[PDB]
Amino acid sequence: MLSFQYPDVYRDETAIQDYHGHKVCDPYAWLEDPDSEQTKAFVEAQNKITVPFLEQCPIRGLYKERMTELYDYPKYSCHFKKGKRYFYFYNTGLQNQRVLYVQDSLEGEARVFLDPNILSDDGTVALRGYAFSEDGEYFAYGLSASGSDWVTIKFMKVDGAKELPDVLERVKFSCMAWTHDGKGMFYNAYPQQDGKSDGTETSTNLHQKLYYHVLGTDQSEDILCAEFPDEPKWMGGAELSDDGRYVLLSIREGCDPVNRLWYCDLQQESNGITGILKWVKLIDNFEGEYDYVTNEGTVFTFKTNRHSPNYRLINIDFTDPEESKWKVLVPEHEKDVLEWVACVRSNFLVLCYLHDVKNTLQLHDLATGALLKIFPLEVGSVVGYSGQKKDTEIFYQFTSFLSPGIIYHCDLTKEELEPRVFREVTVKGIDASDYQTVQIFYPSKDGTKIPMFIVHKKGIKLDGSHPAFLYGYGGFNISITPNYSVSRLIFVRHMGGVLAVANIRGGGEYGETWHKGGILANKQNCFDDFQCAAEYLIKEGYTSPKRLTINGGANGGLLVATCANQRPDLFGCVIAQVGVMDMLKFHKYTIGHAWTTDYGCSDSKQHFEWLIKYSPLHNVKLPEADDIQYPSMLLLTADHDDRVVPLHSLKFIATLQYIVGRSRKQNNPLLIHVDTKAGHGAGKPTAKVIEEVSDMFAFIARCLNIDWIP
Amino acid sequence: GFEP
């Protein structure tokens, strides 16, 4: 079955580092330099064996064709109003990038406002972030090339969609917030660094600053408004209060849902914005999240997790700011996570809750917090919303496993608040009625009950005969909720597959306690939860080890790679996308320093001892038993993934191929594909998305020998 | 959004 040879890869046996007395050899450390001839040759040789492997069987072509057909459906974002105009994003079906449209009224003819597709041949220039001026007459937008986190901000006058000369460089992980006087916009930039800043570099990102750009000037004239030179990892994002009176500064360090909150009454500036603002340090620690919802004069409504792991709404009066004085507007729910809150039509609050990994949406009174209206939803997720304080209507977008979903509209000026379907699209070829979604709760090793969604064709016999695709993430307070995936439904329909999503600890599904259950000393909980999910699917007859594929990306790539090391006997196939593989060195590169709040840092003896136990790069080991080998493994990364630098996957695949791949009993392939002009994934053009899923399921089909079902 |  394996008709290729793994490439020659030099081992630097002298590359030995001492971590608190524990010696670690890193023979592929040289793969950390993306620019070397050695690394470039390594990538070329690896792609040279992977691509022919993926493309040998006609299944790739059948899948690609079906994906191209089925993914070709109209894709809309919610309408949103800015000034006197409406905007929405729309893809006719197969455009590489969705297009931003404008209309002068809801019944008015729409026209193209911003079309990213004309910015490159291959759709690899993508919108990343945008902000309209308060009056809706000016527009700032970020552009990222080749999938990099790096942004260039450009500007337009909305009337006539006129290009303006303003260009902002060195923007990354940035806010965009216009002052309501329409003079300029806050944003973040990083200082100059040696070498490249295009997404191919690994340089750590420190000393992010907050600037104010006056429209009509050169970037070099921009005002420095906040900086933290004594705290190089701090990141301060600005937003304007709804009345335009205050700049709110949310300072973060790491990835925990916490922030400092400082404010600036702009009217108290001595002569407008001219330098470091007169910041008032309302919350000056990282003990809780304070997410601005709205204010009425000095009374500020925040979504918080302070003493409230499932989140709640509090009012803090800037004139009486001590914690003991804060008012609880909407108390914490016992179990349901308050995901997000928006203020609309002056005195309404839109609250979105997560109840057992499904969304609900409710309208509350701002003055009392009292529930006023429940917006009815089927089982699934709210993935889009519009309606700001001055707006008198909302739009919201619902999606689920089995249908692309619906945009709803609700006119909030009406006495009876009845939502109506505004836009709905169905995909011909995938009849939702043929499939079912079930939710179960399985006990993990320590007895903790974990949610899992299972999607499958109705009427299947649970005889262990079905191929299964089990997805997980498990970290960073991210909740993995139902979403429409054409690519996964093709696996079900055309490969006879069962889909599963395990809501393992580390995620946000049951609030901050769920998140804390899968981080730091307890990261092993994630891997245990995920392995127990696999065991559930097997025990209950959905699948069998040899027919089971697991998949995850980034922190999810770490998840599946670790599970391959820990329980190789459990899985037939592993697809790890853009994964964090070197847990000892992740903090050294680009923004990886931010992830130590979930993982710890190997600089600490205590943390090193957690990390060394599960680090994928450091736990590649031949299975003891003669009858057990590693699952088939495919690593996917890209050369501009500056979120998770590709060296992670490069070093990991060299290690897999050397330790496991050289062994006689290993007949399952261990492969990497490194894409070009792509990065971590956000903004990836449609054409590349299609290639990627075609690669993924062709890999599964070849390794598990699955026949296409027409 | 700077999580992995």
Of B1, B2, B4, the CB nearest to A580: B4
C-alpha distance from A340 to closest chain B C-alpha (Å): 16
> From the centroid of its chain, how far is CA A163?
30
C-alpha distance from B3 to closest chain A C-alpha (Å): 7
Give the number of residues written for chain A: 710
| Contact assignment for A594 to B2 by CB distance below 8 Å | yes
Whether A516 and A658 map to the same domain: the answer is yes
Give A25-41 as a DSSP string. Answer: E-TTGGGG-TTSHHHHH
**CA angle at A302 for the pair A299 and A305, rounded to the nearest 5°:** 140
Max Cα–Cα distance, chain B, nearest Å: 9
Domain hosting A695: range is 1-73+427-710
Closest CA to A545 of A662, A437, A627, A461: A627
Q: What is the 3-state secondary structure (H, E, C) of A677-692?
A: CCCCCCCCCHHHHHHH
Which contiguous run of DSSP H or E holds residue A45?
helix A37-55
Angstrom resolution of this structure: 1.9
Which residues have CB under 8 Å from A36's CB, separation 6+? A30
Instruction: Give how far Cα A476 sits from Cα of A286, A517, A593, Å.
Output: 16, 11, 14
Question: Is the Cβ–Cβ distance between A154 and A141 less than 8 Å?
Answer: yes
d(CA A616, CA A574): 13
| A23 strand-pairing partners | A18
Whether A328 and A447 map to the same domain: the answer is no
Whether A376 and A240 map to the same domain: the answer is yes
Structure tokens at A556: 């999810």
What's the structural domain count of chain A? Answer: 2
Q: Are strands A548-553 and A468-471 parallel, antiparallel or unpaired?
A: parallel
Q: What is the 3-state secondary structure (H, E, C) of A484-531?
A: CCHHHHHHHHHHCCEEEEECCCCCCCCHHHHHHCCCHHHCHHHHHHHH
* Burial class, A69, CB count within 10 angstroms (exposed 0-12 / middle 13-18 / buried 19+): middle
Structure tokens at A364: 């509350």
Whether A65 and A78 map to the same domain: the answer is no
DSSP state of A416: S
d(CA A305, CA A496): 43
Whether A484 and A590 map to the same domain: the answer is yes
| Contact assignment for A173 to B4 by CB distance below 8 Å | no
d(CA A157, CA A542): 56
**Strand ranges of the sheet holding A393-399, from the earlier edge strand across to the other edge:** A381-386, A393-399, A406-411, A420-424
Among candidate residues A368, A393, A426, the one where a domain is terminated: A426
| Contact assignment for A255 to B1 by CB distance below 8 Å | no
Whether A31 and A80 map to the same domain: the answer is no
* Burial class, A462, CB count within 10 angstroms (exposed 0-12 / middle 13-18 / buried 19+): middle
d(CA A43, CA A49): 10
Whether A64 and A86 map to the same domain: the answer is no
Among candidate residues A426, A455, A490, the one where a domain is terminated: A426
Structure tokens at A384: 């889009």
Give the number of residues written for chain B: 4
Question: Is the Cβ–Cβ distance between A527 and A563 less than 8 Å?
Answer: yes
Whether A23 and A145 map to the same domain: the answer is no
Whether A104 and A217 map to the same domain: the answer is yes
Among candidate residues A406, A426, A446, the one where a domain is terminated: A426
- What CATH number did the domain enclosing A283 receive? 2.130.10.120
Experimental technique: X-ray
Which residues have CB under 8 Å from A346's CB, separation 6+? A366, A389, A390
Chain B interface includes A591 (CB < 8 A): yes
- What CATH number did the domain enclosing A47 receive? 3.40.50.1820
d(CA A654, CA A31): 9
Which residues have CB under 8 Å from A219's CB, separation 6+? A166, A167, A168, A169, A213
A679-692 per-residue burial string, b: 16 or more CB within 10 A, e: under 16: bbbebbbbebbbbb
A513-527 per-residue burial string, b: 16 or more CB within 10 A, e: under 16: ebbbbbbbeebebbb
C-alpha distance from A553 to closest chain B C-alpha (Å): 8
Whether A450 and A314 map to the same domain: the answer is no
Could you tell me the sign of the dihedral formed by the alpha carbons of A509, A510, A516, A518, in that order?
negative
Give chain B's end-to-end CA distance (angstroms, integer).
9
Q: How many Cα neighbours within 13 Å face the side chain of A294?
A: 20
Whether A589 and A704 map to the same domain: the answer is yes
Which residues have CB under 8 Å from A352's CB, separation 6+? A338, A339, A340, A341, A359, A360, A361, A362, A382, A385
Instruction: Give how far Cα A104 sits from Cα of A81, A86, A108, A169, Å.
Output: 10, 6, 6, 32
Q: Are strands A573-577 and A99-103 parallel, antiparallel or unpaired?
A: unpaired
A223-255 per-residue burial string, b: 16 or more CB within 10 A, e: under 16: bebbbbeeeebbbbbbbbbbeebbbbbbbbbbb
Question: Is the Cβ–Cβ distance between A394 and A344 less than 8 Å?
Answer: yes
Contacts A–B by Cβ distance under 8 A: 28
Max Cα–Cα distance, chain A, nearest Å: 77
Closest CA to A125 of A108, A145, A105, A107: A145
Question: Is the Cβ–Cβ distance between A557 and A579 less than 8 Å?
Answer: yes
Question: Is the Cβ–Cβ distance between A392 and A371 less than 8 Å?
Answer: no
Write A702-707 long-range contacts (CB < 8 A, 24+): A702/A53, A702/A54, A702/A56, A702/A57, A702/A59, A703/A572, A703/A573, A703/A632, A703/A668, A703/A669, A704/A467, A704/A546, A704/A547, A704/A549, A704/A572, A704/A573, A704/A632, A706/A59, A706/A467, A706/A495, A706/A496
Q: Are strands A632-638 and A573-577 parallel, antiparallel or unpaired?
A: parallel
Q: For residue A473, list chain B residues with Cβ-Cβ distance below 8 A.
A: none
Whether A395 and A479 map to the same domain: the answer is no
The stretches of A147-202 forming alpha helices (DSSP H) are none
Question: Is the Cβ–Cβ distance between A326 and A315 less than 8 Å?
Answer: yes
Question: Is the Cβ–Cβ distance between A354 and A382 less than 8 Å?
Answer: no
Mutate to test the interface with B, among A255, A588, A596 (most CBs of B within 10 A): A255
Closest CA to A202 of A510, A644, A515: A644
Q: For residue A519, list chain B residues with Cβ-Cβ distance below 8 A.
A: none
Which residue of chain A is at minimal alpha-carbon distance from B4?
A554
* SS3 category, A651: helix
Instruction: Give how far Cα A511 sits from Cα of A369, A530, B4, Å.
Output: 21, 19, 19
Closest CA to B4 of A380, A664, A577: A577
Chain B interface includes A643 (CB < 8 A): yes
Could you tell me the sign of the dihedral formed by the alpha carbons of A118, A123, A124, A129, in that order?
positive
* SS3 category, A66: helix
Q: What counts of helices (H) and strands (E) characterise chain B?
A: 0, 0
